[PDB]
Structure formats: C-alpha cells, structure tokens
Amino acid sequence: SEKEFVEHARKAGLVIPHERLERPIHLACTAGIFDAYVPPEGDARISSLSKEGLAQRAERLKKNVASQLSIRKIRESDPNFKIKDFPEKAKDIFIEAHLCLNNSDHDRLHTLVTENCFPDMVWDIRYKTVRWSFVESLEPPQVVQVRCSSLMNQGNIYGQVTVRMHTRQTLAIYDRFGRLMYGQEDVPRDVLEYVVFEKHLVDPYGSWRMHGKIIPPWAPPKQPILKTVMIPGPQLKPWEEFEEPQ
Amino acid sequence: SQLSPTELIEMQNDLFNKEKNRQLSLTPRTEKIEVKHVGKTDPGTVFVMNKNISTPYSCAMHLSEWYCRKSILALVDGQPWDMYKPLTKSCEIKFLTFKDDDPGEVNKAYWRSCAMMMGCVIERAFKDEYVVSLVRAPEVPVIAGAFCYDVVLDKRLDEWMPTKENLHSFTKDARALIYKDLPFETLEVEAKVALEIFQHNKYKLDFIEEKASQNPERIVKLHRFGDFIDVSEGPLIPRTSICFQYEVSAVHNLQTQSSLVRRFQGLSLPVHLRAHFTIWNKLLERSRKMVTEDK
Amino acid sequence: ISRKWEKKNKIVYPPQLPGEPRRPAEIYHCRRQIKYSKDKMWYLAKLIRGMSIDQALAQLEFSDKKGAQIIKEVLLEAQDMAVRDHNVEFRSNLYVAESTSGRGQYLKRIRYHGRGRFGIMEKVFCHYFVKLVEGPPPPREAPKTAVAHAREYIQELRNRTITHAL
Amino acid sequence: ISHGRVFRRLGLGPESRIHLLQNLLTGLVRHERIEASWARVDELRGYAEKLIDYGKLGDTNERAMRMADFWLTEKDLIPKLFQVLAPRFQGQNGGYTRMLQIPNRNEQDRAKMAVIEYKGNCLPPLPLPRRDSNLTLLNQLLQGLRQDQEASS
Amino acid sequence: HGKSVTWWDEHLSEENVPFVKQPGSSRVGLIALKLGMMPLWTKDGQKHVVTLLQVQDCHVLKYTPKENHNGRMAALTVGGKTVSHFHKSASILEFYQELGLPPKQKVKIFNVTENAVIKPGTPLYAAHFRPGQYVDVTAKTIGKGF
Amino acid sequence: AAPKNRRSIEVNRCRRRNPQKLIKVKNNIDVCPECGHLKQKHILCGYCYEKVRKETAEIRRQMGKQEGGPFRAPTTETVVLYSGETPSEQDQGKRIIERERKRPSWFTQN
Numbered sequence A: 001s002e003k004e005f006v007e008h009a010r011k012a013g014l015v016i017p018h019e020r021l022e023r024p025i026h027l028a029c030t031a032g033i034f035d036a037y038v039p040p041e042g043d044a045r046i047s048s049l050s051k052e053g054l055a056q057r058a059e060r061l062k063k064n065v066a067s068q069l070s071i072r073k074i075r076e077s078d079p080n081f082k083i084k085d086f087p088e089k090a091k092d093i094f095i096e097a098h099l100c101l102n103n104s105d106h107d108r109l110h111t112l113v114t115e116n117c118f119p120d121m122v123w124d125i126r127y128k129t130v131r132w133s134f135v136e137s138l139e140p141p142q143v144v145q146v147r148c149s150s151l152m153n154q155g156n157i158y159g160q161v162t163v164r165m166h167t168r169q170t171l172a173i174y175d176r177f178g179r180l181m182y183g184q185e186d187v188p189r190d191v192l193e194y195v196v197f198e199k200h201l202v203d204p205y206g207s208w209r210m211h212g213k214i215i216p217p218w219a220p221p222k223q224p225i226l227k228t229v230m231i232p233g234p235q236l237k238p239w240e241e242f243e244e245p246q
Numbered sequence B: 001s002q003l004s005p006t007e008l009i010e011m012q013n014d015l016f017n018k019e020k021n022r023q024l025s026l027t028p029r030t031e032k033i034e035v036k037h038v039g040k041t042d043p044g045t046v047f048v049m050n051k052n053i054s055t056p057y058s059c060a061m062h063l064s065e066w067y068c069r070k071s072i073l074a075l076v077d078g079q080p081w082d083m084y085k086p087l088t089k090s091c092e093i094k095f096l097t098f099k100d101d102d103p104g105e106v107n108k109a110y111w112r113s114c115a116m117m118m119g120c121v122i123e124r125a126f127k128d129e130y131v132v133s134l135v136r137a138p139e140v141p142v143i144a145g146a147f148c149y150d151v152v153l154d155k156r157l158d159e160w161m162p163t164k165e166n167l168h169s170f171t172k173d174a175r176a177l178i179y180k181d182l183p184f185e186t187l188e189v190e191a192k193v194a195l196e197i198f199q200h201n202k203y204k205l206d207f208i209e210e211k212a213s214q215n216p217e218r219i220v221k222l223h224r225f226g227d228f229i230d231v232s233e234g235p236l237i238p239r240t241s242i243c244f245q246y247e248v249s250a251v252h253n254l255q256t257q258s259s260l261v262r263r264f265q266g267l268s269l270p271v272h273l274r275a276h277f278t279i280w281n282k283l284l285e286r287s288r289k290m291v292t293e294d295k
Numbered sequence C: 001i002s003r004k005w006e007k008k009n010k011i012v013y014p015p016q017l018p019g020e021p022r023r024p025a026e027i028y029h030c031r032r033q034i035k036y037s038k039d040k041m042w043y044l045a046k047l048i049r050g051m052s053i054d055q056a057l058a059q060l061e062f063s064d065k066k067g068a069q070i071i072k073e074v075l076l077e078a079q080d081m082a083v084r085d086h087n088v089e090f091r092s093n094l095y096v097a098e099s100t101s102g103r104g105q106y107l108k109r110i111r112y113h114g115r116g117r118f119g120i121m122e123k124v125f126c127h128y129f130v131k132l133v134e135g136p137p138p139p140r141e142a143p144k145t146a147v148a149h150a151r152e153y154i155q156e157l158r159n160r161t162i163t164h165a166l
Numbered sequence D: 001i002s003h004g005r006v007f008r009r010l011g012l013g014p015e016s017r018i019h020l021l022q023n024l025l026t027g028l029v030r031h032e033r034i035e036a037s038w039a040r041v042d043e044l045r046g047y048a049e050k051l052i053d054y055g056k057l058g059d060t061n062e063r064a065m066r067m068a069d070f071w072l073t074e075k076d077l078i079p080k081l082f083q084v085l086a087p088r089f090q091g092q093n094g095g096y097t098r099m100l101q102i103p104n105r106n107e108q109d110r111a112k113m114a115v116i117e118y119k120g121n122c123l124p125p126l127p128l129p130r131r132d133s134n135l136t137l138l139n140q141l142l143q144g145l146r147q148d149q150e151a152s153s
Numbered sequence E: 001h002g003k004s005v006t007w008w009d010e011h012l013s014e015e016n017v018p019f020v021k022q023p024g025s026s027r028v029g030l031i032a033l034k035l036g037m038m039p040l041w042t043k044d045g046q047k048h049v050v051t052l053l054q055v056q057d058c059h060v061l062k063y064t065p066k067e068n069h070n071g072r073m074a075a076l077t078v079g080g081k082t083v084s085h086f087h088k089s090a091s092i093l094e095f096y097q098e099l100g101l102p103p104k105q106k107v108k109i110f111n112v113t114e115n116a117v118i119k120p121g122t123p124l125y126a127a128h129f130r131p132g133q134y135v136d137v138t139a140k141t142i143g144k145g146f
Numbered sequence F: 001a002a003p004k005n006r007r008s009i010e011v012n013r014c015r016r017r018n019p020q021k022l023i024k025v026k027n028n029i030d031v032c033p034e035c036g037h038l039k040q041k042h043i044l045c046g047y048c049y050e051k052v053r054k055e056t057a058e059i060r061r062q063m064g065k066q067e068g069g070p071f072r073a074p075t076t077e078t079v080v081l082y083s084g085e086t087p088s089e090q091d092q093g094k095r096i097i098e099r100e101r102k103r104p105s106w107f108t109q110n
C-alpha cells in the first residue's frame, strides 16, 4: 500500500553550480554584434545607379580608420587574407546556407552559420517545409565594414565583416499539412540585406561563418501572409472596467 | 426575343459571374486592413482582414460561433453592411442581432429579404406561357402586418383570383426554398450592366433608372441567392435559413391607368424570434388586410 | 507507459500540388494523469463527440462534473495550440473529431472494513485524448426511412440465389 | 405521502429548521441581500414577507414586539426594522422581496443557489432578466395589432 | 441545427404581456369538477353524504361513427374545464381552432347509441341530470405512489 | 447475496452506454447581452453577478470600516455616493457611504 509516484520534472538554476564549473563553457562566437551599421536612407535609389554607389561604398571602405585598423589586425593575425575575394565567398556561403536550409541538413548548416545564427533560422521553420532558389544578383555584393575587438581574458579576436547584398530570391514556405502559407514559388522578388559574417582568429581552423542579419530601419514591409490573423484585446477580470486609449 | 426560362437565368448567372470576376481582378494583391471591434461585449479586439476578400462573417469566425449564429448585420462606422459583403478599408465594426435595443436596421433588412424571397417564389411559381414581371419591393415599416411585393402578370390572367390551395402552395415552395441553404451575395453593379441584366422587364429598368438617379456614381446594389438576381437598396440578412415561419397571407389588386399590379402580402418570423401558434394566427389574421404605404 | 499522442503532432506531410483540394488541419492534444475516474471521464468524452468547439465549451461550462473543467482547459489550450503553432485561421471553425479516455497508473491503498479484514483500494488516474479537425462539423446521420428499408429488403430478396443448385 | 405539505424538511428537525431560518432571516434583515441554497431561501421568502407585515403593525404592538424579539436574534435590528424597513414599505401589499437563482457554487457540492433581497436596498442592482425592447420585431408586430384594436373602438 | 427551446413568455415585453393576456338507448355523459362534500338529510331522519360535482365548461367535441369506432355504439367526444392556449400542443390547438372553442383539460369518449347523437360544438349543463337517478362516476383516484 | 457468474463486457457496455445513464444536452445556453459571456436562460449571469458581488463586498467592507461595533446598527436609511458626487436634499438625513472609484455604468444614481 505504501507506494508513491516519481519523476516530477523541474528546471532549477542556482548561482553555485554555475560558478562551480571546473571547465568553463567555451563560446566559439560572441553573443552580441559590436556595432550596427547605419546606412544612408537613399539606398533604394542609389542601388539603381552603377558608378555612384560602387565608388561611394569604396570611399567608405578606404576612408574609415577603425575598419582599416581591424582589417590590418586580421592580416596580422592571419596571412593570405583579401578583402576583394571575400564577397564571392560570402555570396557562396549565403547560397549554400539557404540551400542547406531548403534540404533541412543541419550538420552543413552547423559548419556554415554560427551559434547565434542557427536557432533564428531553424526554430520556426523546422516543423514547416520550404523551397528556396537563387535566380539572379542585380548588384554584386559590397563589403561594407569590418570590426574587431580583443577580449583580454583569453586574448580572443572575433572579426566581423558586414556585407550588403541586393539579391533576387524566390521564397516559398509550405505548411506541415502541405498547403501554401507565405509566398509563391515563381515570383523573383528583389530584396536587400546587411549580413554580418564572423571568423574567430585565434582558432587555427577558424571557418568563415555567418553571424547576424541586419535589416535597414526604412526598409519596405515584407509581403503579406495568406492566413488571416486576429489580435485579441486584453482579458478582463470582473472588477476592472475597460478603458479605450486614443 | 426567343429566350427560355432556363437560358435567361443562365444569362444573368453568366453575366453576374463575369462581373464578379471583374471585381476580383480589380484587386490584384491581398492588402491587410486593420479593423477595430467597437462592440460592447468585446472591446479592443484588433482584426487583420484581407482587402475585398474577407467578410464580416470571416471576422466573426475569429471571435466565436455565437457571433456567427446571432450576428445578422454589421455596422462599419455609421452604415450597415451585409454579413457576407467584403470589406474595403481599415475601419471599425459592430454587430447587431435581433436581440439588441435598437434592432431597426436588422428588422428592415429581414423585411426586404423576405420581400425578395417572395419575389423568388412568384417569378418561378407560374407557367412559361404567361409572363411574370416583378416591379419592386415597396418599403413599408415593420408596424404593418405583412411584407408585400408588386407583380405585373399576364393580360389574360386578370380574371381569376388565387385561392387558399394556391397560397399554401406558395407557402410550401417558400419553405422548400428555406430548407435548402443558400447564402446572400451582394455586388455593386453599374447601371448599364444592371439594365443588361434585367433586359426585358421595363418596370425593373425604370426602377434601376430611378435608383441610379439618386446616386451620382450611377451604382446599384444587386443581391443574389441561389440562381435569382434581384435588386434591393441597402443591406439584407446573411442566410436563407434564418426564416423559421413563412406564410404568403393574401393577395390584392391595385389598378393604375397604365397597369394592374398584384400586391402579394406575407408574414414571416425567424428562428430567433419564433412565436406561439396562437400569436402566429392572430398576426396572420392581421396580415390579410390591405397595406398601402409607398412614400 | 506509452506516449504516441504527443508524437503524432510532429508528422510533416509533403506539400500539395496546385489544383488539389485543400487539406484540413488535424490537431492532436492530450493530458496525462488526471485524478478523475476513467468511466466518468468517458461519459464527458462521449458527450462532446462530433460537436463544434464553441458549443462543446458551452456544454462543459454548465456540466457539473469535475472533469468538465479539465476538458474545458484541454479544449482551450488545444485551440490555442491550433491558432498559434498551426496555421488555423477562424478559431471557431474547429470540431471535436475524436475524444476518448484511457486509464493511467493506479496507486494501491488499504481500505479497512472490520473484523480484522481489509480490501485493496485503487487510486484511479485517467488520461484524456482529444483530436480537433479544421472544418465544419459532420452532419448527424438521420435514421433510415421506410423507403430506404424497402429498398434494402427488396435488394436482399433480389440477391437471393438458388442454393445447392446444380 | 406528502399531500398538502407546505413546509419542507430542513436541519435536524423542526426546531433546527426554525433556528436555521431564524439565522437566515437575521442575516437578511441585517445585510438586505443574502445568498444561500435555493430551498432555504425559498422557505425564507415567506418569513421575510410576513416579518414586514408584522413590522407594519407598529412599534407599540406587543405581539409584534415579541415576534421581532424572537426572530431578530441580534437586538440592534429591531429598531432597525421598526424605523427603516416598515416605514419604507407602505404602499405595496406583498412586493417586499426579490428571489433570483444564482448559478451553482464553485465548491465541490454544486448546490443550487438563490439570492434574496428587499426592495429599495442601498446596493448595486442585480443583473435582472430584461425583456425585449418594444422596437423588437415581434413586439412591433403585436403593437400593430394593438393599434388596429384601438382603431376598432 | 441546435435550436434553443422557447416558450410563449420569452420574447414578449411588459407592455405586450397584458395585451396578449387580454328502450335500450344510452345518453351523453358529462365532465365535471369535484368541488367537495356536504351533509344532507332525508325526511325519515337519516343522514347521507353528497359529493359536489360542478360542471364549468362541457362541450361535445367530435363524433365518431358506429362502424368506425366499435361496431355497436357510436362514440362522442367530450372535453372538460377550459385551460390555457399557450401550454397545449400544436395539433391540439389546430383541431380546436377548426372546432371553434378554447382548450380543454381532459378529453373523454362516451359510448352513445345513434338515436342520441349530438352535433359537435354543443354545450352541456347539469340539468342534463334530473333529481332522482343513478350515475356511474369515473376518475383517477388519489395517487399514493410507491 | 453473492454473484453467480461474471458479467461480460457486452452486458456491461449495454448497461453503461444506455441513454438514460448518458449526460443529456442542455438547450437553454444563451449569451449575455451585456458582457457577451455565457449564461442559462433562467439563471443570472455569473460574470455580472461577480461584478455586483465584488462591488457589494467593497461597499460592505467600507461601511463596516465606519462603524466600530458589531452591535451598532443604523437608525436611518443608507445612501452610497462615489467620487465627484454630493448628497442630494432628498438624500440628506441618511447616512453617507463614500467611495473613491468612479460610479459604474450599470449602477445608476436614483
């Protein structure tokens, strides 16, 4: 008769076991982005001009002081590094990462994108099915800026390269029941991104990885969803009356 | 012209679907319209509908099936709309049932709905060799006992008077119309398109001319349920099945110097407001009498 | 034990070609180790079979059983799962396709009687399962009319053959 | 056989029934609105109706004074009755109290509840079952009959 | 269609409720109301007990012929005291609407020979019975339950 | 008495699935015209009565705050007013119940 149930699962975190790690947790990449690039607001209109935008991006490349100091730090930590050949590698990493997201192969995506990047591109989309295709690139990608910071606790250097790409994509998100949810398959929608890439410099292997995704504040809104959405009001306890703000 | 009753209904059905597809192609992309709920029961609710696709019925499906069953009219700002008429702009919405303290617009919409229903009964309940010309739905308020429809009939038909068996036959196929479930559809139709729809019926063309004289944009409201297209200004009820009790009470003669019209008068009561048998018989005894109100 | 009802929500179907009918949603939810009894739980599960979710919650609001509140909470959280995690617009357009109750893990106690005797007392735990399908509720089957019965019985006579014949 | 019985069985007997209904009547007099079980409130309604009739007989009436002394067990309520409730109820003959059916208790008993109150109490009104308005469809159709009956006389 | 239940007093408002409120032959029997009991005395000095039977509304309702009811004697349908319209059934109110009378409480059948037939819709009175006669009395007895 | 044979599951299913032992449907469920919640037709709304009961509890607590004794009862009538209100001339001579919250939409002045 004297028998009781077991296995009541709870998650209890305390300061003492998180301090008593004999081996500290090693982060291969940093959490936050150090500085967010603020673009000029007319970039929807300079992007249709050839000689203005390319030379102006090159001028912001060659006139910056801290960006060039970080680039000099990257060549001093690791030789045979070229700014000019880097946007081709960034475009190939972008195409391969989105194609591996299409194929739902997570190990190649672990090799490509970083720890801060992975759940943002897996969490909502894994229960869904998507098909992504790359068709054109109207503008070649611009290396916008390069930053570094030396963490003195271990002597670690993380090199971030913010890269702007104007990209033509055909994006479709399908529901887990198979029906169409977000967007069509045959539309070549033009889009712009400011993707920050990162590389650990102290690491002898140190693969060039995709760190973060930056949208401009003035960017056009995304295409409307097919499914109809209700936002309910505040749930009211009986002795609280409703108040309508203006 | 040589047009059978099957082919003519096929003609207005084909033109109505063509005009509907023109309005569907007028909106190329789905646009998100922000609707606020200003109802007393559920304030502060924010709805995100599609432009010219989503309806207040689809809005009520987001809330509950209780609103879908009870809600009969929808006020966008100060003007009532149909429950299946698609929304156009970002706005605020309120729902009215029969139960509310000011149910007048709902009562009017139900009244004009039964007028169109009796029009559907009469225009298909007669022979093909005679001619049935529907005039209009004269708007008498709810204080009168019966809703009435004016019908121009054949010149050789003016002698005989329809009997109790004929009136119960009208009641029977009216209830057969109730038993099948048909939604009410609303479309804004240009005046020359409405003239092409109504075609031979000169009283209907005169009614379209009169209703388009009052609007500078030359628009009219066309309502369709099943296969019948009929004109009525203002809103109607969403569903056929809202009627529980229906009766075609009495017919009457009205003579003008140019025409002799038959005024068909009937009484109906909903599923929500169905009454007792004795009360229904007293109201039916009232509804046999003459109703004369045009202006 | 066995956990398969929770696993059934992880099934991803292949995408539908255009021109195909639209596949309705199917939402599987369950709650384990409820203190209520299995057969008493089954009565409430039998009450709401085939009904839409709003009228099901309407009946379970005013049902006086203890498990009515439990199924009410389960139906609200299943509707919440359907409206966010699946792409179910029109949250009132759901119906209860399948609702049934299984038995959980039982605890044994001693129920004392007298004269030194005893009986084992079974602490009853039960599970509840619910399946919500997007779409209108199916129409309830009417009883067979006399024309239908005559049709089947004349067909039964017409299907007669001569037996042990040749 | 319960033919012709108007008093239902409550408590541990007739004396316990009288004491429980005395407690309920004392609470109703003190607070002017109390909620209890439906059967106890339904039995309490007649006592609350006749208590106002006994208070109508005046402060100087000895029989009413001893009736209120027994039934109002808290002794402050007898001046409260004779100087609040009896002057306030003068015109109406038997419309002293309102009985309404409260939904079932949130405790595990799920008992059937009723609220009892007096007219003119200093409390927010209960959500009374309101009838349909006269602008409703059936009411307007019957007002048409009423107008035709007035026009026929 | 999950149609809700309704009654006559649901959708009515307070202004409209009082508006709505405003040699071998056999004889025909009666439906009465048992009022009470009284003593009575006879001229020889003895005391008897009389039960009071009040006829309030007695009308013949319909007539069933000889060959359609039993084959020996015809059937006459007699109603009792008058009750409300709103708590009776639809077919009952329809047949009483065709008949012409308000709803009755209890409906009974009497076996009557063809020479004693009464046209339906005819009222009846206690002077149908004369002082000094013998009657048979049928009723539901006092139900004492299980 | 002791049972003679074990009842089979067919007879048990016939007993326990019989319609008199099933839970009957309720057709008197209606929506409240004020708050839009659910109530039965002959029973007051639980949400509205919860509002009335909480306001009544607040009124009763604040009037029990004014009187420091269990055996002291008012000789005259009681009136209640909210913030931004003054007692009327017909309401004078009656004891005053002041509340800080605004007067509700359901509760009238009278």
Ligand SMILES: [Mg+2]
Pocket: C116
């Ligand atoms: Mg012992």
Ligand SMILES: [Mg+2]
Pocket: none
């Ligand atoms: Mg055993």
Ligand SMILES: [Mg+2]
Pocket: C120, C122
């Ligand atoms: Mg056992």
Ligand SMILES: [Mg+2]
Pocket: D010, D011
């Ligand atoms: Mg007891």
Ligand SMILES: [Mg+2]
Pocket: D003, E142, E143, E144, E145
């Ligand atoms: Mg009895």
Ligand SMILES: [Zn+2]
Pocket: F032, F033, F034, F035, F036, F037, F045, F046, F047, F048
């Ligand atoms: Zn309410």
